[PDB]
Design an enzyme around this catalytic site. Structure first.
Site, PDB file in Angstrom:
ATOM      1  N   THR A  42     -11.716 -39.063  91.210  1.00 20.26           N
ATOM      2  CA  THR A  42     -11.385 -39.884  92.369  1.00 20.26           C
ATOM      3  C   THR A  42     -12.350 -41.046  92.506  1.00 20.26           C
ATOM      4  OG1 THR A  42     -10.580 -37.874  93.416  1.00 20.26           O
ATOM      5  CG2 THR A  42     -10.891 -39.817  94.829  1.00 20.26           C
ATOM      6  N   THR A  43     -13.654 -40.754  92.537  1.00 21.73           N
ATOM      7  CA  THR A  43     -14.672 -41.801  92.588  1.00 21.73           C
ATOM      8  C   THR A  43     -14.608 -42.724  91.375  1.00 21.73           C
ATOM      9  OG1 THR A  43     -16.074 -40.203  93.771  1.00 21.73           O
ATOM     10  CG2 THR A  43     -17.136 -42.201  92.992  1.00 21.73           C
TER      11      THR A  43
ATOM     12  N   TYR B 135       0.521 -36.315  97.877  1.00 16.05           N
ATOM     13  CA  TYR B 135       1.699 -37.079  98.286  1.00 16.05           C
ATOM     14  C   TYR B 135       3.004 -36.279  98.317  1.00 16.05           C
ATOM     15  CZ  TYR B 135       5.031 -40.808  98.887  1.00 16.05           C
ATOM     16  OH  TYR B 135       6.028 -41.617  99.385  1.00 16.05           O
TER      17      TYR B 135
ATOM     18  N   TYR C 143      -9.408 -28.643  91.898  1.00 18.58           N
ATOM     19  CA  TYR C 143     -10.029 -29.580  92.817  1.00 18.58           C
ATOM     20  C   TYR C 143      -9.191 -29.562  94.094  1.00 18.58           C
ATOM     21  CZ  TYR C 143     -11.454 -34.346  94.352  1.00 18.58           C
ATOM     22  OH  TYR C 143     -11.845 -35.452  95.052  1.00 18.58           O
TER      23      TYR C 143
ATOM     24  N   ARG D 292      -7.485 -35.574 101.277  1.00 12.66           N
ATOM     25  CA  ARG D 292      -6.710 -36.535 100.514  1.00 12.66           C
ATOM     26  C   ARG D 292      -5.324 -36.052 100.121  1.00 12.66           C
ATOM     27  NH1 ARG D 292      -9.710 -40.853  98.922  1.00 12.66           N
ATOM     28  NH2 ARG D 292     -11.975 -40.622  99.099  1.00 12.66           N
TER      29      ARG D 292
ATOM     30  N   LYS E 292     -13.807 -27.098  92.462  1.00 16.60           N
ATOM     31  CA  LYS E 292     -14.303 -28.175  93.185  1.00 16.60           C
ATOM     32  C   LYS E 292     -13.798 -28.128  94.538  1.00 16.60           C
ATOM     33  CE  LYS E 292     -15.097 -33.102  93.342  1.00 16.60           C
ATOM     34  NZ  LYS E 292     -14.478 -34.326  92.852  1.00 16.60           N
TER      35      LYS E 292
ATOM     36  N   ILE F 167     -20.230 -31.496  92.503  1.00 15.93           N
ATOM     37  CA  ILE F 167     -19.651 -32.707  91.923  1.00 15.93           C
ATOM     38  C   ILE F 167     -19.720 -33.777  93.006  1.00 15.93           C
ATOM     39  CG2 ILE F 167     -17.646 -33.755  90.811  1.00 15.93           C
ATOM     40  CD1 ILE F 167     -16.964 -30.772  89.826  1.00 15.93           C
TER      41      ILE F 167
END
Lengths: 296, 296, 296, 296
Positions: free
Chosen positions: B44-45, B107, B133, B138, B162, B204
């Site tokens: 993501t980052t 989504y 994750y 999100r 994660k 992480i």
């Protein structure tokens, strides 16, 4: 241009997991002949997330060609990647779509400046009208009314909103901040009735895939101000609106279509699955029976 | 294999919006030399959402090449499209990644059956270890503990999580349901300390991009059981953790690295923007100076 | 019995923090003469939380006596203590109230069995009609439609709902599950319009304290099916509905009343405060100007 | 003064619905003998909402009398009515409580100015130490760190927090904003372990009513810095923490105490109910037996 009942079209797939083009064409023809006033191909209900770039463009092209100017086509051009959204939007324009549906970016959660950059970048890259698709139940972030009004004031071709919040006080806020010329479409079937009395003029609909005629009759009654009859239609449709999202609507809609005898396979793409719980299928079957559409 | 401080690496870009391969290599080498214990490229980052397929693959290949076996590499290999996830996962395996980070789909909101199908299909398509994750802030949906345990029980290469919820009670639930052998890594810098005492073994990290040495020292103190010392680091780092997500952390991290003299441009891909409010930059600079990170 | 515009009456206080009985009587007289169709004394807007048991009973008695049968009186009998709710309800019956408003218990968060016990215990202890007040923005818990329908079926004197959720799809669900004989009143001013088109017949209102005539004209237009005119009224009232809950509505309403020149002191009871931010007072003043009610 | 395991005491009732004073005294004496370090009478778990003023006072007086200086007593002294809060607080001081637990007001949702007025008025009315009880899962509103710090800076007898958020990042923020001298106590049993490593020094506990010795041992290990041992206790206790709030913990705690042979009736006051689902009782019994708590 866009009003009354507008299906967010499913994308049917073959056993072999290709786009079932003949099924899609048939579904579009049937939608038009039953009274749907517009088409949204390759939106959320269209499984945009699991279409390749190529397949997304094919779905839009095929919807534009099939519709052949009979009803307007608002192509899905949504992603959380601005460059890709531009490319989808420019493909839709060049293939003959009439307007664009652009979702607030999901997952990466831009702030207000990022929304201005995303929607502004798209507005600069096409001349088609753009409808903002606000659905925080899927995007987490919600475009606020100040941002919406700023986009509408800045860019001539940002003309409307798909408002899927189900909080209709927002329809009033958006009407006052953006003007009564701003085209507001409900993106929530179960609150579409109240959304129109607050200023909306139509609904981009899941249930219309399944019951296009009654959804069209519902929206016609609202447009004629027969809100007594519209409530009568609401009470008949509401159990079907609700049954179709017990489990994910894309699977539920395709199940309902096959139970109606339409040429639509049950196939969906991972991470969606076609298997529904017994209780879910029965809730859908009873809601279809209640609109006669099945048993009577 | 994965423990202590693991940056979710940024993906630097050039003024021309290409991958800044030289900046990326220097960032990895600096991270290793400062004490980071592992690497997560194209997460993501790392702006995975705005990378093309070929760029994502190139970011993973480069990170594997640069790590040169010194530290393990957990490749981002997850989208909301299962087929694309399998393709990113298999690329990562064939180029030499040590493990995979697979986000819960965003989504399109699969149900539990869809999560089993998604993670199961990926686990059957590769032999690499997989880390789930879970980031509902999100994705909206949250993998529950029963589902996580079923996956661990069913697929031997689903090996860890994660956990970016920031609700550390879930660390205790996952430890009990999945086994103390299940590898739990924090995905939330600000609660990583408590996460580890509940059973986690590392983080992480977003902040490790900016302050890799102190983040490594913090995690080292935890693994030594010097929790008194770990709390002193927490008090120094917490203002920086917090200041980096006033606005989207991708933009904030690159701002901070640029300020510290690292060869990282400010460029980000829309809908991220590089422009930060002055109050945001001021908060970041104050937190950086409290730690003492400016060489000059 | 209860329809159209029904103020949730404020409780005015003197400088010395006693109930300002003459102010209260005057406010009631004015409400009736401007077109309000009913009265709810000692609800949330009435500061029920900071009234003593004795003062709560006095407020209800004084509202019943003042109204003198001209409009019906639905007394607040809400608390999160069932025994106390019974006592308030029996006082209201014995003093001549026409119906009871009973909030879903707050803070202690009963489960569904606890709601059945609370509302059943009250229904057994009085013969007055009871309206369920559903407001999860204050109670956290929300009575679901199955529970509401069960209460309506079990007890003849549970007749209606104050629905303050602002999610009008619930109005449709409650209409189908409880029957069209079930009296649904909006408890959310800004969505009252859509709530009535979905089956509601009135609104228990904050804004009616301030603009009773226009609120009454708004509700009259809805009842006559002039939904075009109702939307015209909605667009004029919405900025006032919204301005009154920038800060807590009880303080905001009393400020608005004094700016209208009514004999209402600004005094509220801790933990409410009368001090409003400059920007809040200006938002209210402009919304009042926009309905002429002040400047024109 | 307050540290390690502090039960939020239940208030037992007789079959006639009076306070079971003998059962309450025996419960306190048993809690002390098993290692509880302090007592909170007439809190949330003590059914404060369904106690009259005189019963609440009597519960506090009895707890102070019974503790006999062996352990400190933090009296529940908070409602959503500031004047009533002052009255409960002053009673508690005059009968010999050592400190006060003051909840953020529920239901009527004061703003920040109202919180300052509420906690400031209480702090000026007594000289006892005050602990802010932040529980947004019940109050909806959440005191933010700036407000908490302002109160600590302004009122010397506002000395600590009961932080029931379960979001332990707030422990780091409160420690930095308010000082390491600010006393932080967990209000969430399941996250109490991480809370303490972030700066907390104990837990005001639901589960300690049921399992006071193991909860005391758990907290002792933490204060000794035996975090490895604390995690073994966590793994034994977490299923019980969780099973006790499947349904409201007041009912579940009394069910468990009755099963263990304690002289505590099942009686609770509506809207709490004593009837539990069989699946709930089964989960509680399994968690109790995993710990080994049945004497027989």
């Amino acid at each position: 241009m866009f009003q009354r009942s507008i299906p967010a079209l499913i994308t049917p797939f073959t056993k072999d997991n290709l786009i079932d083009e003949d099924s899609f064409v048939d579904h579009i023809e049937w939608q038009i002949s039953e009274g749907s006033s517009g088409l949204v191909p390759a939106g959320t209900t269209g499984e945009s997330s699991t279409l390749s770039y190529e397949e997304h463009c094919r779905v839009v092209e095929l919807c534009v060609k099939t519709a052949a100017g009979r009803v307007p086509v608002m192509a899905g051009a949504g992603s959380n990647n601005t460059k890709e959204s531009i490319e989808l939007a420019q493909y839709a324009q060049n293939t003959g779509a009439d307007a664009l549906l652009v979702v607030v970016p999901y997952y990466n959660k831009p702030n207000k400046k990022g929304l201005l950059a995303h929607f502004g970048s798209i507005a600069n890259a096409v001349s088609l009208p753009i409808y903002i698709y606000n659905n925080p139940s899927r995007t987490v972030i919600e475009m606020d009314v100040d941002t919406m009004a700023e986009l509408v004031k800045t860019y001539s071709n940002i003309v409307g909103v798909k408002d899927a919040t189900g909080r209709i006080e927002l329809a009033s806020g958006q009407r006052i901040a953006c003007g009564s010329d701003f085209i507001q479409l409900s993106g929530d079937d179960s609150s579409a009735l109240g959304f129109n009395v607050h200023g909306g003029v139509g609904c981009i609909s899941v249930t219309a895939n399944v019951a296009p005629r009654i959804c069209a009759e519902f929206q016609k009654a609202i447009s004629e101000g027969d809100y007594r009859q519209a409530l009568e239609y609401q009470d008949k449709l509401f159990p079907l609106h609700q049954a179709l999202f017990i489990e994910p609507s894309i699977s539920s809609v395709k199940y309902a279509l096959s139970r109606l005898g339409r040429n639509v396979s049950l196939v969906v793409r991972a991470p969606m699955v076609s298997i529904l719980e017994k209780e879910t299928m029965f809730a859908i079957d009873q809601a279809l029976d209640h609109i006669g559409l099945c048993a009577g």
